[PDB]
Amino acid sequence: ATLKEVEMRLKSIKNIEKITKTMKIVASTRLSKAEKAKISAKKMDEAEQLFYKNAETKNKELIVAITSDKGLCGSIHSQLAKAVRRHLNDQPNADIVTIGDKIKMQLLRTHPNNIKLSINGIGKDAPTFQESALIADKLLSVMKAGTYPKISIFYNDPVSSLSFEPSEKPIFNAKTIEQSPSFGKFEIDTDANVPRDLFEYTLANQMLTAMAQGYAAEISARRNAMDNASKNAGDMINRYSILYNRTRQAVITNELVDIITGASS
Amino acid sequence: RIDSVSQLQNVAETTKVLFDVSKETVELESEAFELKQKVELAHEAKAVLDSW
Amino acid sequence: AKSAANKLDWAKVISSLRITGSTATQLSSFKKRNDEARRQLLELQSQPTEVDFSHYRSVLKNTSVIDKIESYVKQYKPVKIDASKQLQVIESFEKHAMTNAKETESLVSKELKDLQSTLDNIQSARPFDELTVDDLTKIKPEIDAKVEEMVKKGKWDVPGYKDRFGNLNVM
Amino acid sequence: YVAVGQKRSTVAQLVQTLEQHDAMKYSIIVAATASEAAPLQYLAPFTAASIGEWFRDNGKHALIVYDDLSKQAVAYRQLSLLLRRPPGREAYPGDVFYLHSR
Amino acid sequence: GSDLDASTKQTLVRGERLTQLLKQNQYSPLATEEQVPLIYAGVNGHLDGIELSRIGEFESSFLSYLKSNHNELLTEIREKGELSKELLASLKSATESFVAT
Amino acid sequence: ISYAAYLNVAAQAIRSTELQTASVLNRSQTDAFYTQYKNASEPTPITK
């Protein structure tokens, strides 16, 4: 009917509302863990950065990127996708390694040469050193990571807990570490494998931090998104409710007219 | 090298058949032009007779 | 009918696939197909070639205009001129073509049997152990030419030797 | 092809279309244009049906399009409401079902 | 916003082509003998790869191709009204031949 | 073997006496298949 088609749709909107409510709450729950992790990760990174700062290291170019493997994250996926494309105007030949299905698809469309390595299954779980390490190891074996005298990694820095800003940072290269202005204030062996090791060690350690930042932005963004979803769905409830209520009255009226007509006869 | 040669060998004879045939077909279409002009004139004649 | 030509044509399309180039062969095939497809669609389009003065004259009250257009149709029963127009040029082009065809054909037939003979010669005498290097000089003075040129050059490195035969070295 | 309730212009175009595709030479076009009486409209499918039955009887196979059958219902609605029969659901007389079924 | 897996997108891709295959312009009936090939091609997924835009082109051209060579085949479909082994094979080969060109 | 891969394997082994947290174990179990991507193309999604 009008009445029934209204009603089934109103029920649909109600169920949607309930789901968006539920998701928003669950997102808050998940967010607490995500943020907690991000603190520890950031502290860990900072010690390595302490070396790089004092070292004043100063960074073909490689691009690595990090996003969710799945939607309903917000605009994390496509704000980063746009910012990659922007920095792919800053290098017209770079190999993009995509950690995350969502960033993978979007970049894959725009340059179907650049996508060289990609991962899948990272985003489902909160970041883990094991994952980051294996990706780093694979980056070395498959892509020969040290060869690139530039590497830059992309992630979404969660600027404020209502925001996410797509962000990049430059991963330092082993050639660079050798010749970095300070590398002599620090003292180590002449039989050192310190370039070939330290590069590799921070390849993962920096990458994990980037993942932690990214994951936190994903969970933060979905919380924001699902909240806004709840508001929009509510408006649709109100609109179909008025329609339902009017339609219900109208059905009564239409029935009454038939009755009156019958009575008159 | 024998493989390359063999492709060319079989082609070389057989192609002359098609060469002739294709041009022969084009000759048939010339005669078809005469058909078209018969068809046209008749159709027109029928149409006027209907108008009358 | 048309189908004999077209089966043989398409058989040749996948044969012409075997040879290289056909950027304007296909335009010729397209032309023969196009116009062949036009004449059949013409022949199916066809109306009877004269008026039905059976029904449509006995309807008409305005007499002897059916007789006029009948006489106009029977006048133009001679349509217009038709002849084999390519009859000098088709024989000339095919003659030239035939010459070229026979030339390629005879060439490849010769080459095929030459390749058979060489294949047989490598099979019936394959040196891969022994056969005097003096005999290799005897079958190729290219050997002595290179040796003399190397001695004249004052170079005892043979490039290519090293890239598929190792060098014994103590360095 | 039975045309009930349609404007003369649609019908005229339709017969023209059928002549255009030269498919007029084996058709019967039964018409009851929009102006034409509600009684004539009510009677129109049923009189088309009999013409069809002449084919059916002959052993001939044929096909009858009843377009729009919906307009028969409107016609019967009018007919009944001015015969002052008690009006059925949505003012279509109840034996509209019977009419259409038969 | 469900991110489809490839298996579902095989179906989706196949499905889209069928939809384009069905469409017919008003006042353009077709001969059933030449509707059987079009469905054979579609159902046997030969059109799945073919780009979405040029499906209509493929349809038109395929029919022309079948008119050109396999006009014997069409006559048989008219005559026997059930596809025989020979017809299925002929049709399969023909369809394959027209996928590219 | 990569130096950091070497450290990684050692860390995974090192969570073995045992008393350990689920989160540690989760941190020591991978859950991914790396999809190598050729030039568009993509060699097999080998379990990372």
Pairwise CB contact (< 8 Å): C6 & E69: yes
- Please report the domains of chain F, with CATH numbers, ordered by start residue: 1-48 (1.10.1620.20)
Q: Which residue in A61, A137, A127 sits closest to A100, CA to CA?
A: A127
Give the C-alpha separation, A108 to A96, whole Å.
9
What ranges in D7-86 are assigned the alpha helix state H?
A: 8-20, 38-58, 70-81
Nearest chain E residue to A105, by CA: E3
Q: Which one, of A151, A196, A147, A187, lies nearest residue A169 by Cα?
A: A151
Q: Are A93 and A146 in contact (CB under 8 A)?
A: no
Q: How far apart are CA F3 and CA A138, in angstroms?
A: 12
* Closest to A80 in 3D by CA, of A110, A46, A59: A110
Q: If you write DSSP's letter for every residue of B18-47 in order, what string do you get?
A: HHHHHHHHHHHHHHHHHHHHHHHHHHHHHH
Count Cβ neighbours within 10 Å for each residue of E18-49 and write b for 16 or more, e otherwise.
Answer: eebbeeeeeeeeeeebbebbbebbbeeebbbe
- Cα angle vertex A154, ends A148, A157, to 5°? 145
Give the list of residues 6+ apart from residue E58 with CB closer than 8 angstroms, or none: E47, E50, E98
- What the block records as the tokens of A158 is 């969660």
Token pair recorded at residue A145:
């990571």
Q: Say whether the peptide bond before residue B50 is cis (omega within 30 degrees of 0).
A: no
**What does the radius of gyration of chain B's CA atoms come to, in whole angstroms?**
23
Taking the C-alpha atoms of residue A122 and residue A99, their distance in angstroms, rounded to an integer, is: 7
| Helix B2-51 / helix C89-123 crossing angle, nearest 10 deg | 160
CATH number at residue A146: 3.40.1380.10
Q: Left if phi > 0, otherwise alpha if psi is -120 to 50, otherwise beta: which for E73?
A: alpha
Instruction: Find out whether A168 and A153 touch, Cβ atoms under 8 Å.
Output: yes
Per DSSP, the three-state class of D23 is coil
Q: How many other C-beta atoms can be found within 10 angstroms of the C-beta atom of residue A233?
A: 19
Strands A95-99 and A165-171: unpaired
| Rounded CA separation A54/A77 (Å) | 34
CA dist A39 and A53 (Å) reads 20
**A106 and A38 inside one domain:** yes
Write out chain F in H/E/C secondary structure.
Answer: CCHHHHHHHHHHHHCCCCCCCHHHHHCCCCCCEEEECCCCCCCCEEEC
DSSP states of chain C: -HHHHHHHHHHHHHHHTTSS--TTHHHHHHHHHHHHHHHHHHHHH---SS--TTHHHHH-SS-SSHHHHHHHHHHT-S------SSSSHHHHHHHHHHHHHHHHHHHHHHHHHHHHHHHHHHHS---SS-S-HHHHHHH-THHHHHHHHHHHHT----TTTTTTS------
Residue A166's φ and ψ, nearest 5 degrees, are: -70, 140
Beta bridge partners of F35: A118, F45
Encoding tokens for residue A53?
């700062």
Partners of residue C37 in chain E, C-beta under 8 Å = 64, 67-68
| Residues of the domain holding E5 | 1-101
Lookup: tokens for B11: 């082609």
Q: What are the sequence ranges of the domains in chain C?
A: 8-111, 119-171
Q: Do C3 and E64 touch (CB under 8 A)?
A: no
Domain hosting A4: range is 1-25+226-265
CATH of the domain at A255: 1.10.287.80
Close Cβ partners of D78 (under 8 Å, ≥ 6 residues apart): D38
Is the minimum CB–CB distance between A71 and chain E shorter than 8 Å?
Answer: yes
Backbone angles phi, psi at A168, to 5 degrees: -140, 165
Q: Identify the burial level of C121 via C-beta atoms within 10 angstroms of its C-beta, where 0-12 means exposed, 13-18 middle and 19 or more buried.
A: exposed
CA distance E41 to E65: 13
End-to-end, the C-alpha distance of chain D in Å comes to 19
Count of A-D CB contacts under 8 Å: 10
The 3-state DSSP class for residue E83 equals coil
Residues of A in contact with D89 (CB under 8 A): 258
Q: Which two tokens stand for residue F37?
A: 């991507």
CA distance A260 to A206: 80
Helix (H), strand (E) at residue D63: none
Q: Residue E4 belongs to a domain with what CATH number? A: 1.20.150.20
Specify the residue for token string 């095919």: C94
Q: Which of the 8 DSSP states describes residue A164?
A: -
Say how far residue A17 (Cα) sits from the centre of its chain.
Answer: 24
- The two three-digit tokens of residue D19, written as one number: 């002549």
Question: Cβ separation of E3 and A72 shorter than 8 Å?
Answer: no
Are the C-beta atoms of residues C9 and B18 closer than 8 Å to each other? yes
What is the resolution in angstroms?
4.5
Helix A194-264 vs helix A129-143: crossing angle, to nearest 10: 110
Report how far residue A154's alpha carbon sits from residue A166's, in angstroms, rounded to the nearest whole number.
7
Chain interruptions in chain E, by residue before each (C–N > 2.5 Å):
none
Does one domain contain both A19 and A32?
no
CB atoms within 10 A of CB E99: 14
C96 interface with B at CB cutoff 8 Å: no
Is A196 found in the same domain as A92? yes
Task: Give yes or no for A263 touching D (CB within 8 A).
Answer: no
Contacts (Cβ under 8 Å, ≥6 apart) of A3: A244, A247, A248, A250, A251
Residues β-bridged to residue E77 = none
Touch of E by A (3+ CB pairs closer than 8 Å): yes
**Direct distance between the N- and C-terminal alpha carbons of chain F, in angstroms, rounded to an integer:** 15
Assigned token pair, E60: 């038109």
CA dihedral C40, C45, C47, C49 (to 10 degrees): -30
**Alpha carbons A98 and A154: distance in angstroms, whole number:** 9
- Residue A185 contacts F, CB cutoff 8 Å: no
Do A200 and A247 reside in the same domain of the chain?
A: no
A36-to-A41, A43, A76, A132 alpha-carbon distances in Å = 9, 11, 20, 18
Which of F15, F24, F35, F38 should we substitute to test contact with A (largest number of A Cβ atoms within 10 Å)?
F35
Per-residue tokens: A61 = 């170019």
Q: Pairing relation of β-strands D30-33 and A165-171?
A: unpaired
> Which residues of E lie inside 8 Å of C (Cβ-Cβ)?
64, 67-69, 71-72
- DSSP letter assigned to residue E84: -
How far is the C-alpha of A67 from the C-alpha of A65, rounded, in Å?
A: 7
Rounded Cα distance, E84 and A265, in Å: 67
> Token pair for residue C51?
């008026």
- Among residues E101, E88, E96, E100, the alpha carbon closest in space to that of E36 is found at E88
- How many residues are listed for chain E in this entry? 101
A5 with A41, same domain: the answer is no
Residues of A in contact with E2 (CB under 8 A): 71
Residues of E in Cβ contact (< 8 Å) with A72: 1
Measured distance CA(A118)–CA(A98) in Å, rounded: 5
Sort out which chain D residues have CB atoms less than 8 A from A262's CB and list them.
Answer: 86-87
CB atoms within 10 A of CB A195: 18
Q: How many domains does chain E have?
A: 1
Determine which helix (DSSP H) or strand (DSSP E) holds D5, and give its type and residue range. strand D2-6
User: What six digits make up the tokens of A178?
Assistant: 């050798």
Query: Is C70 within 8 Å of C53 (Cβ atoms)?
Result: yes
8 Å CB contact between B20 and C87: no
- Measured between alpha carbons, how far is A140 from A203 in angstroms, rounded to an integer? 9
Q: Number of residue pairs across B and C with CB atoms under 8 Å?
A: 138
A110 and A42 co-located in one domain: yes
- Chains meeting D at 3+ CB pairs closer than 8 A? A
Whether the CB-CB separation of E52 and E17 falls below 8 Å is answered with yes
Angle, in degrees to the nearest 10, between helices C66-75 and B2-51: 150
Distance of residue E11 Cα from the nearest chain C Cα, in angstroms:
32
Count CB-CB contacts under 10 A for residue C85.
Answer: 12
Task: Decide: F6 and A204 in contact? Cβ < 8 Å.
Answer: no
**C-alpha Rg value of chain E to the nearest Å:** 15
Q: How far apart are CA A206 and CA A200, in angstroms?
A: 10
Structure tokens that stand for C136 in this block: 């290799």
Phi and psi (nearest 5°) for A111?
A: -130, 110
- CA-CA distance, B44 to B47, in Å (whole number)? 5
β-pairing verdict for D30-33 and D2-6: parallel
DSSP state of A126: -
Angle at the Cα of D12 (from D10 to D15), degrees rounded to 5? 110
